[PDB]
Amino acid sequence: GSSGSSGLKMQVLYEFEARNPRELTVVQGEKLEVLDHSKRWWLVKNEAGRSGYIPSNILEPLSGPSSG
């Protein structure tokens, strides 16, 4: 893991709580990186290095000054 390939990044619109070893707890207003956005549930990771499943419903397209 190092500054390289630029995949996809998303933020948390609503805080969610995990209830399994596969899911990860996330808060609102947080910046996370997407890994697997294929299945109904998307997989993200945190700074700590932990990756868990989360509902894409709480994921928004981190807007930016990028032209368009």
From Swiss-Prot:
Residue intervals of the SH3 domain: 8-62
**From what superkingdom does this record's organism come?**
Eukaryota
Q: Where in the cell is it found?
A: Cytoplasm
How does the record describe its quaternary structure?
Interacts with ABI1. Part of a complex that contains SOS1, ABI1 and EPS8L2. Interacts with FASLG.
The family this protein is said to belong to = Belongs to the EPS8 family.
Q: Which disease is it linked to?
A: Hypotrichosis 5: A form of hypotrichosis, a condition characterized by the presence of less than the normal amount of hair and abnormal hair follicles and shafts, which are thin and atrophic. The extent of scalp and body hair involvement can be very variable, within as well as between families. HYPT5 is an autosomal dominant form characterized by little or no scalp hair at birth, wiry and irregular scalp hair in childhood, and sparse or no forehead and parietal hair at puberty. Eyebrows and eyelashes are thin, and pubic and axillary hair fails to develop.
Record's protein name = Epidermal growth factor receptor kinase substrate 8-like protein 3
**Source species:** Homo sapiens
